[PDB]
Design a protein around this ligand. Structure first.
Ligand SMILES: [K+]
Ligand SMILES: [K+]
Ligand SMILES: [K+]
Ligand SMILES: [K+]
Ligand SMILES: [K+]
Ligand SMILES: [Mg+2]
Ligand SMILES: [Mg+2]
Ligand SMILES: [Mg+2]
Ligand SMILES: [Mg+2]
Ligand SMILES: [Mg+2]
Ligand SMILES: [Mg+2]
Ligand SMILES: [Mg+2]
Ligand SMILES: [Mg+2]
Ligand SMILES: [Mg+2]
Ligand SMILES: [Mg+2]
Ligand SMILES: [Mg+2]
Ligand SMILES: [Mg+2]
Ligand SMILES: [Mg+2]
Ligand SMILES: [Mg+2]
Ligand SMILES: [Mg+2]
Ligand SMILES: [Mg+2]
Ligand SMILES: [Mg+2]
Ligand SMILES: [Mg+2]
Ligand SMILES: [Mg+2]
Ligand SMILES: [Mg+2]
Ligand SMILES: [Mg+2]
Ligand SMILES: [Mg+2]
Ligand SMILES: [Mg+2]
Ligand SMILES: [Mg+2]
Ligand SMILES: [Mg+2]
Ligand SMILES: [Mg+2]
Ligand SMILES: [Mg+2]
Ligand SMILES: [Mg+2]
Ligand SMILES: [Mg+2]
Ligand SMILES: [Mg+2]
Ligand SMILES: [Mg+2]
Ligand SMILES: [Mg+2]
Ligand SMILES: [Mg+2]
Ligand SMILES: [Mg+2]
Ligand SMILES: [Mg+2]
Ligand SMILES: [Mg+2]
Ligand SMILES: [Mg+2]
Ligand SMILES: [Mg+2]
Ligand SMILES: [Mg+2]
Ligand SMILES: [Mg+2]
Ligand SMILES: [Mg+2]
Ligand SMILES: [Mg+2]
Ligand SMILES: [Mg+2]
Ligand SMILES: [Mg+2]
Ligand SMILES: [Mg+2]
Ligand SMILES: [Mg+2]
Ligand SMILES: [Mg+2]
Ligand SMILES: [Mg+2]
Ligand SMILES: [Mg+2]
Ligand SMILES: [Mg+2]
Ligand SMILES: [Mg+2]
Ligand SMILES: [Mg+2]
Ligand SMILES: [Mg+2]
Ligand SMILES: [Zn+2]
Lengths: 147, 307, 150, 110, 153, 99, 43
RNA sequence: AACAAACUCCUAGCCCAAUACCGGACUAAUCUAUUGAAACAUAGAAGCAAUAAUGUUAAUAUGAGUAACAAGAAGCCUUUCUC
RNA sequence: ACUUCCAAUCAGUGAAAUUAACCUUCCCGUGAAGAGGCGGGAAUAAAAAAAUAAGACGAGAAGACCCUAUGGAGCUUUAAUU
RNA sequence: CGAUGUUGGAUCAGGACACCCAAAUGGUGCAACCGCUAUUAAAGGUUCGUUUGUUCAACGAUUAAAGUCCUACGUGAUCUGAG
RNA sequence: CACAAACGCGUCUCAGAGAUAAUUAAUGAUUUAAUCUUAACCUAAUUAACUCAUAAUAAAUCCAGCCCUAGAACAGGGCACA
C-alpha cells in the first residue's frame, strides 16, 4: 500500500499539486497470496457497524481474507490516502485482482511494473546443489547418533 | 411539439370498434392453439433426472378456499390455485444470469394488447403470444431447460409434493404502530390523556438519536412474501386447478408464483415427478379427471367407519 | 482580500524594455486654484519644479489650468489608455514632487494583485518534464506482461 | 414546538419551487368541432352545454305556466313544438308545449 | 382499510345519505334531467336504474308501491312513474340513464359536476361526444381490412 | 483576520509544496530527498528549494546532473568512513574557501 | 472506550505519555554543551 | 540525517503583542467668525459618530400559504322537498 | 368492526409563540467536566409530501425551592422609642 | 438558578457479563438421583396475583428461569400524579 | 359481523453447510524416556454467535378517462373475449 498510495496521489510527479487532477492507475495482481508479517493473521481484526442495534461485527484478518480475497489490500490503501473528498475519486483508479486473470483491455494499458518491496526468501528445495556444497558444514555430528 | 395524448379508442369509428376487438381476439386463439404441440415443434433435448436438479415452477391464479377431510377424520383447508395461461418466455444462459444456475422466464395470464408498452408488445410479437400480466424469473439447472414458448399445465405438480408460494400480500395501507408491529396500547380510562395507540418512548436519552432499526408507523402489507412447506392434495386436469394445504399469501384473483419446496427435508423429491415438465402429447394417454392423494377422502367414497 | 478583487499576471505593455525603453507616461493636467489656501502646494510646485520637470521628461505634455476649485487634482494618462486620477489637496512641495515622480515611473497597467512575481515566454529550455522523460525503454517496446508475437 | 432558526431564502426557494409544487400543464385540450371554442376530451363543451341549458330553462318555464298548481304533473308523455309546426299522428295524446322562436338547428324533430 | 366497500359516505351519516339521494331522485323523476356533484350523481345512478325495475313490476304490486312511496317524496310523481316512465322503458334492460361530466361549476368550490338524465326525455339533446366518421383516413384503412377479410373468409 | 494568518501560512505551504516536488524528482533517479540535499550542500552548491523545484520540472537534464552530483558525493563520503579516515578528500569533496 | 478521568495532564491520574528516543538525544546534546560551558569558566 | 515557530539571519522599511486604569497624535459629520465658490483652509463652539441595554417607534421577513374559519338539496329562482 | 367532527387532495381568506449567522450527519476521544462545528476515523447526487417525539442542555415565565442584599412588606410579642 | 421539571408505575426498550434458564466442560467429602464449586458462551427468554404511592420486602399459585447493573438511578415537546 | 370486507378467540407455515471458546485425545522434538504442540506436519471429538448455500426483488420510455381486494397526495394493477 505504501508505494501504491504514492502513485494514486501523484506524489511521484514533480508537477504534483492537490488542486490538479494528476493521478495514475495502479493494477495489483496476486492479492490472495499476500504475506502478513508476524501473527497478524489471527490478531488484527477489521470491524464495522451496520447501523442497526446489535449490528457490530468484528472479523479476524484470516476470516476476512478467506471471504473477500481483495479486501485486505483495498482497506489498507483506503486508509492511507488523504482523507479529503478526492479519496473516493482516486480509489476508482485502483484495480485489484485475486490472481493473474486480467482482462485484455487492462493488460494493453500497462506501461511498467514496479519492483517488489520485499525480497522473497527461497525455500530449502529451491537451493541448487552448487549452493549447498558452497556453504560450509559448521559442525561434525558423531557417527553413532541416530537422527 | 406538444403532441396530445391518445388512446386506442380515440380515433376509432363506431363501425370499426367491434371489428378491431374481433381482429385481436381471433389472433389470440390462433396463437395460443398453435403452441399446443411442444414435442412436435422441434423441442430442446430432454435429459434424465439427476440428483440436485431443480424444475420449473408455474404462475397461477388464486380462486378461493375449500375444506378437505383426510381418512383419519382430521379437517384441512385447501386453496384453489388455477393455472390459466402459462408459457415459458425466454431462457437466460448460466453465465449471464447468476453463474451457477440458468434462469427461465414464465409469464402470467393473458391481458389486452392496448394497455401495454411498445417494447413489451414488440417482444411478444416475435415470440407469437398474447401479452401476459405478471412475469417471474425461475432458477433452473442446465439439465431441466425448456424451449421458450412451451405451454405448461397444472399437471406439472403431482399430488403428494410440497410446494412454495410467493405473491404480494394484502396491502392495508398506512397503518399505525399497534396494527403493524403489535405493540400493546396504553390504558383507555384511567386518566390517560390523548394517548391510546401511540408507540410511546422510541429511544433513550443518552444516545440522542433514533436507531435505524426502530419500529415506526408506515406502509403495511403490499410486499412480497413466501410460504414454505405447503403440501399438494388434489390436482384437477381439465380445469388446471391445484390444491395446496394451508393459506397462501395474496388476495383473491391474484397471481401466485408456485415452485417446488426448497426446504432441506423436501430435497430430491422429484425423481418420481415429470421432468422437466408434463408433456400431454408424449404420453398419448388420458390422465384421470382428478388426482387424489392417498390420504384424501374422495367425494364419491363411502362414509368413514372407525371399526 | 485576494478573493474579493481581480488579479492579473506580470505583463509589460508592448514588450517594453526589450528593444528600447519608452516612457509610458503621456500627459499630466493640473487643476489648481490661485486663491484657495488648499492649493498652496500645487502653486509652489508649478513655480519651481514644473519647469525643471519638463526638461528631464521631454516625452510628457504638462497642462496647467488655474481655475476656481476646492480640491486640486492631477490627471495622468498613459499610452495604453489608462487614466489615473490623483489628488494633491493640501500637500507640501516635496510631497508633490515625489507623487509626480512616482507617476512617471509607472507602466500604466492596473494596480491589482499580481499572481506571480515573474513572467517568461518559452521557459521549457532543454525540454519539459513528462512521465516518459525518465523511464527506460524496453527492447521492442513490450508491455510488462506482453507475449512476443513470434 | 417552535422553530430553532430562521429559514434562509436559499432553502425556501428550493422548497417553494420544487417540481411537485409547480402547476402541471394539461395536454387534453381540444377545440369543439361545432362552435370552435375550447373543451377537454372527456368533458362536454361549456359553450354548447350552456346553449342547451338556456333553452331547457325556457321550455321548463313554459311548462310551469301550463300547470298552475305546485303538485300538478302530466300523466302522459310530453312533446315540445316550435313555431310553424303542428302535432303529428304519433304525437297525439300528449301535452303540447308551444314556443314562439324558430326550431333550433341542434334540436332534431322525430 | 376500505376494501370491498361500494358505497360512499355522504352528508351527516348513513341516514342522511339516503335522504340526500331521496331528494336528488325526486328531482330526477320530475324534471328528467338534473345536474349535481359528480360523486353524488354517480351514487344516484344506481338507484335510478333499479327504480325503473320496480316500476316495471306494475301498479298493483304492493312492494313496488311501498318502495316508490318512500323515494318519491312528492306524491304527484307516483302516477307519473307507473304510467310514463315505466311504459316508456320496455325494450332495454339496463340502458335507462346517461351520465356525462359537466365542466366545473363557476363558483368558489370548483366542484366536479355531472349531468344525469333519462332516455327519451322531452328536452333538447346534450352535446354527446360523437365518434369519428367512417370516412376518416384511419377508418378507411381499417375498412380495407374488413372488406378483404370478408371476401376470403 | 484569515487573510493575514493565511499570508503567514502561504510561505509555509509553498515551501512544503517544493519539497514534495524535489522528493518526487529525486526518487525518479533512485535517490531519497534527505540524501539529495545534504550531499549537495557538501559540494558548496547553495541553491534554495524554490529554484530546485523549477529545475526539476523545466530542466529534466540539469536536475539529473545535480542528482548525479549528489550521488557521487555521497558515495565518496562512505568511502572515507569505510577506510582508516586518513584518505585524502575526494575529488568532489575538496572544500574551497574564498578569502 | 477507555477515558482519562478529568483533565488529561493534571491531577492524580494523568496520561501515560512516555519519553521518546528523540527526547533522550535532545537532553544529551544540551548536556554536552553545558559540560563545555563549565570548563571554560573553571580557570 | 531530514522535515519542522511570533525565535534568529537575508532584501527593503513607516524598526516590536495585550485585558482594567492612565498618556499622546490625528479625524468623519454639523453651525458660527474670515477665506473658499464643481465643496474647501485656519480657528472658535457643541444635542459632535451605535454589529449588541429580553432597548423605543415605524417597516419588513422566518414559522407559512402552515394552524384555523363557512353555504342542507333540486328547479321553472325563488317554489317545492330533507331535517 | 362501523359511523360523525378532525384528518389528506382541490378552491377562497389567512394568524401565533420562535429566529446571531448556518452550506444544519454518525461513532469514539477531547473539552467550562453531556459536541451537527474541535481531534482521530466513518458515511455522503439534490429536492417535495405524509408520519413517530430520542436530541437541539427544545419553546414559554430576568426560578416559586436555597443563599446573598447594613433591599421591602404582612402578622405577633416579654424587642427599642413613644 | 433571564429554569438541566423531581419518586413509582404504563408504552418501547438500547447495552454490558461479574450468567438466572437454555448449550459444552474440569473438580468433588461426584455410585445413581438431587447438589456444591470452577472455566467458556450474551443470538433468544426471564410469569400472573393479595397488602403498601411505593422501588424494596412478606405471602398465595406457577415456570426451563422469574439474573445483577448501566442508560439525565433510560423514557412526562408520549401518558399517569397515588406520593 | 344490518357492505360485497375487516377482525381473533379461528386456520396455515417456520430450514441445510462452514466456523469456533473452555475442554478431551492421537503422533512427536528441544530433554533419543515421557509429554494434546505461544515446537513443526497431519488428524479427531467439540458452546453460542457469526458467515453463507438457498429464497424474495427483476421487462427503461401505453397512460387522457373509468374501475380496483392498489392508495393520504403522488405512484401501482386492470379497461380483447367480461
Ligand atoms: K486527571
Ligand atoms: K424529538
Ligand atoms: K437551575
Ligand atoms: K439480554
Ligand atoms: K514438554
Ligand atoms: Mg388497501
Ligand atoms: Mg388496550
Ligand atoms: Mg389536559
Ligand atoms: Mg382518551
Ligand atoms: Mg451521538
Ligand atoms: Mg406510504
Ligand atoms: Mg371504494
Ligand atoms: Mg363530509
Ligand atoms: Mg361508482
Ligand atoms: Mg475530561
Ligand atoms: Mg504526564
Ligand atoms: Mg521554518
Ligand atoms: Mg505595548
Ligand atoms: Mg480577569
Ligand atoms: Mg474644523
Ligand atoms: Mg450623541
Ligand atoms: Mg443603526
Ligand atoms: Mg424572550
Ligand atoms: Mg437593539
Ligand atoms: Mg419607515
Ligand atoms: Mg409567507
Ligand atoms: Mg409545518
Ligand atoms: Mg385544517
Ligand atoms: Mg388551501
Ligand atoms: Mg446537508
Ligand atoms: Mg462526547
Ligand atoms: Mg470531526
Ligand atoms: Mg475532522
Ligand atoms: Mg401537513
Ligand atoms: Mg409532519
Ligand atoms: Mg448548538
Ligand atoms: Mg429536556
Ligand atoms: Mg428551555
Ligand atoms: Mg434572577
Ligand atoms: Mg422562600
Ligand atoms: Mg454586610
Ligand atoms: Mg433595610
Ligand atoms: Mg427603607
Ligand atoms: Mg403600611
Ligand atoms: Mg418593651
Ligand atoms: Mg436560555
Ligand atoms: Mg420501566
Ligand atoms: Mg434489551
Ligand atoms: Mg464469563
Ligand atoms: Mg445451564
Ligand atoms: Mg428518570
Ligand atoms: Mg416519570
Ligand atoms: Mg404533556
Ligand atoms: Mg422528554
Ligand atoms: Mg396528591
Ligand atoms: Mg519419544
Ligand atoms: Mg446471501
Ligand atoms: Mg398502470
Ligand atoms: Zn362547443
Amino acid at each position: 500500500a505504501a508505494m501504491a498510495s504514492v502513485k494514486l496521489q501523484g506524489l511521484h510527479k514533480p508537477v504534483y499539486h492537490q488542486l490538479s487532477d494528476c493521478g495514475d492507475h495502479v493494477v495489483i495482481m496476486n492479492t490472495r497470496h499476500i504475506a502478513f508479517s508476524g501473527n497478524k493473521w489471527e490478531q488484527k481484526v477489521y470491524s464495522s457497524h451496520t447501523g442497526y442495534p446489535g449490528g457490530f461485527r468484528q472479523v479476524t484478518a484470516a476470516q476476512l481474507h478467506q471471504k473477500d480475497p481483495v479486501a485486505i489490500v483495498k482497506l489498507a490503501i483506503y486508509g492511507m490516502l488523504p482523507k479529503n473528498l478526492h479519496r473516493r475519486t482516486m480509489m476508482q483508479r485502483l484495480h485489484l485482482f485475486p490472481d493473474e486473470d486480467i482482462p485484455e483491455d487492462i493488460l494493453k494499458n500497462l506501461v511498467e511494473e514496479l519492483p517488489q518491496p520485499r525480497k522473497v526468501p527461497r525455500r530449502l528445495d529451491e537451493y541448487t546443489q552448487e549452493e549447498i556444497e558452497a556453504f560450509p558444514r559448521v559442525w561434525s555430528p558423531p557417527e553413532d547418533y541416530r537422527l | 411539439h406538444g403532441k396530445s395524448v391518445t388512446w386506442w379508442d380515440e380515433h376509432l369509428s363506431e363501425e370499426n370498434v367491434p371489428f378491431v376487438k374481433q381482429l385481436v381476439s381471433d389472433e389470440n386463439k390462433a396463437q395460443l392453439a398453435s403452441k399446443l404441440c411442444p414435442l412436435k415443434d422441434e423441442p430442446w433435448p430432454i435429459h434424465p433426472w439427476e440428483p440436485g436438479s431443480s424444475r420449473v415452477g408455474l404462475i397461477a391464479l388464486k380462486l378461493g378456499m375449500m375444506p378437505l377431510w383426510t381418512k383419519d377424520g382430521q379437517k384441512h383447508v385447501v386453496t384453489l390455485l388455477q393455472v390459466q395461461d402459462c408459457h415459458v418466455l425466454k431462457y437466460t444462459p448460466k453465465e449471464n444470469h447468476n453463474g451457477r444456475m440458468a434462469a427461465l422466464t414464465v409469464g402470467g395470464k393473458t391481458v389486452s394488447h392496448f394497455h401495454k408498452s411498445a417494447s413489451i408488445l414488440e417482444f411478444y410479437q416475435e415470440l407469437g403470444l398474447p401479452p401476459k400480466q405478471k412475469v417471474k424469473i425461475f432458477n433452473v439447472t442446465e439439465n431441466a431447460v425448456i424451449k421458450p414458448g412451451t405451454p405448461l399445465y397444472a399437471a406439472h405438480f403431482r399430488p403428494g409434493q410440497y410446494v412454495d408460494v410467493t405473491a404480494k400480500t394484502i396491502g392495508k395501507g398506512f397503518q399505525g404502530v399497534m396494527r403493524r408491529w403489535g405493540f400493546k396500547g396504553q390504558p383507555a380510562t384511567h386518566g390517560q390523556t390523548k394517548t391510546h395507540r401511540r408507540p410511546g418512548a422510541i429511544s433513550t436519552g443518552d444516545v440522542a438519536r433514533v436507531w435505524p432499526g426502530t419500529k415506526m408507523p408506515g406502509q403495511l402489507g403490499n410486499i412480497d412474501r413466501t410460504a414454505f412447506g405447503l403440501k399438494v392434495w388434489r390436482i384437477n386436469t381439465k380445469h388446471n386447478i391445484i390444491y395446496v394445504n394451508g393459506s397462501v399469501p395474496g388476495h383473491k384473483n391474484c397471481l401466485v408464483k408456485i415452485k417446488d419446496s426448497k426446504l432441506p427435508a423436501y430435497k430430491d423429491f422429484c425423481k418420481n415427478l415429470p421432468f422437466p415438465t408434463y408433456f400431454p402429447d408424449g404420453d398419448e394417454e388420458a390422465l384421470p379427471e382428478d388426482l387424489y392423494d392417498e390420504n384424501v377422502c374422495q367425494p364419491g367414497a363411502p362414509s368413514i367407519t372407525f371399526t | 482580500t485576494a478573493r474579493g478583487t481581480a488579479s492579473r499576471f506580470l505583463t509589460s505593455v508592448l514588450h517594453n524594455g526589450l528593444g528600447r525603453y519608452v516612457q509610458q507616461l503621456q500627459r499630466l493636467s493640473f487643476s489648481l486654484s490661485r486663491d484657495a489656501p488648499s492649493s498652496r502646494g500645487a502653486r509652489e510646485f508649478v513655480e519651481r519644479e514644473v519647469t525643471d520637470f519638463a526638461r528631464r521628461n521631454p516625452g510628457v505634455v504638462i497642462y496647467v489650468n488655474p481655475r476656481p476649485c476646492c480640491v486640486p487634482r492631477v490627471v495622468a494618462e498613459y499610452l495604453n489608455g489608462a487614466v489615473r486620477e490623483e489628488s494633491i489637496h493640501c500637500k507640501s512641495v516635496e510631497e508633490i514632487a515625489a507623487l509626480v515622480q512616482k507617476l512617471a515611473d509607472q507602466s500604466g497597467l492596473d494596480v491589482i494583485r499580481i499572481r506571480k512575481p515573474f513572467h517568461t515566454d518559452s521557459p521549457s529550455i532543454q525540454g519539459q518534464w513528462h512521465p516518459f522523460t525518465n523511464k527506460p525503454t524496453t527492447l521492442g517496446g513490450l508491455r510488462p506482461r506482453e507475449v512476443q508475437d513470434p | 414546538a417552535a422553530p430553532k432558526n430562521r429559514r434562509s431564502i436559499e432553502v425556501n426557494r428550493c422548497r417553494r419551487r420544487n417540481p411537485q409544487k409547480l402547476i402541471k400543464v394539461k395536454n387534453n385540450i381540444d377545440v369543439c368541432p361545432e362552435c370552435g371554442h375550447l373543451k377537454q376530451k372527456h368533458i362536454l363543451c361549456g359553450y354548447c352545454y350552456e346553449k342547451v341549458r338556456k333553452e331547457t330553462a325556457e321550455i321548463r318555464r313554459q311548462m310551469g305556466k301550463q300547470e298552475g298548481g305546485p303538485f300538478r304533473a302530466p300523466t302522459t308523455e310530453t312533446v315540445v313544438l316550435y313555431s310553424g309546426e303542428t302535432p303529428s299522428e304519433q304525437d297525439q295524446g300528449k301535452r303540447i308545449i308551444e314556443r314562439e322562436r324558430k326550431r333550433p338547428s341542434w334540436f332534431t324533430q322525430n | 382499510i376500505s376494501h370491498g366497500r361500494v358505497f360512499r359516505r355522504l352528508g351527516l351519516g348513513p341516514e342522511s345519505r339516503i335522504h340526500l339521494l331521496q331528494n336528488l331522485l325526486t328531482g330526477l323523476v320530475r324534471h328528467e334531467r338534473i345536474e349535481a356533484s359528480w360523486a353524488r350523481v354517480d351514487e344516484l345512478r344506481g338507484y335510478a336504474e333499479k327504480l325503473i325495475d320496480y316500476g316495471k313490476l306494475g301498479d298493483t304490486n304492493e312492494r313496488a308501491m311501498r318502495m316508490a312511496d318512500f323515494w318519491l317524496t312528492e306524491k304527484d310523481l307516483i302516477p307519473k312513474l307507473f304510467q310514463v316512465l315505466a311504459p316508456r322503458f320496455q325494450g332495454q334492460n339496463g340502458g335507462y340513464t346517461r351520465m356525462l361530466q359537466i365542466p366545473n361549476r363557476n363558483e368558489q368550490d370548483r366542484a366536479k359536476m355531472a349531468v344525469i338524465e333519462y332516455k327519451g326525455n322531452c328536452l333538447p339533446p346534450l352535446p354527446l361526444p360523437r365518434r369519428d366518421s367512417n370516412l376518416t383516413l384511419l377508418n378507411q384503412l381499417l375498412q380495407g381490412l374488413r372488406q378483404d377479410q370478408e371476401a376470403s373468409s | 483576520v484569515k487573510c493575514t494568518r493565511a499570508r503567514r501560512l502561504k510561505k509555509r505551504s509553498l515551501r512544503t509544496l517544493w519539497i514534495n516536488r524535489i522528493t518526487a524528482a529525486s526518487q525518479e533517479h533512485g535517490l531519497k530527498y534527505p540524501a539529495f540535499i545534504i550531499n549537495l550542500i557538501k559540494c558548496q552548491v547553495e541553491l534554495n528549494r524554490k529554484v530546485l523545484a523549477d529545475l526539476a520540472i523545466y530542466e529534466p537534464k540539469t536536475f539529473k546532473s545535480l542528482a548525479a552530483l549528489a550521488k557521487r558525493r555521497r558515495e565518496e563520503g562512505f568511502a572515507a568512513a569505510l577506510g582508516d579516515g586518513k584518505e585524502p578528500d575526494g575529488i568532489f569533496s575538496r572544500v574551497v574557501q574564498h578569502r | 472506550r477507555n477515558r482519562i478521568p478529568g483533565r488529561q495532564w493534571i491531577g492524580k491520574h494523568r496520561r501515560p505519555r512516555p519519553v521518546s528516543a528523540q527526547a533522550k538525544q535532545n537532553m544529551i546534546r544540551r548536556l554536552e554543551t553545558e559540560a563545555e560551558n563549565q570548563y571554560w569558566l573553571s580557570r
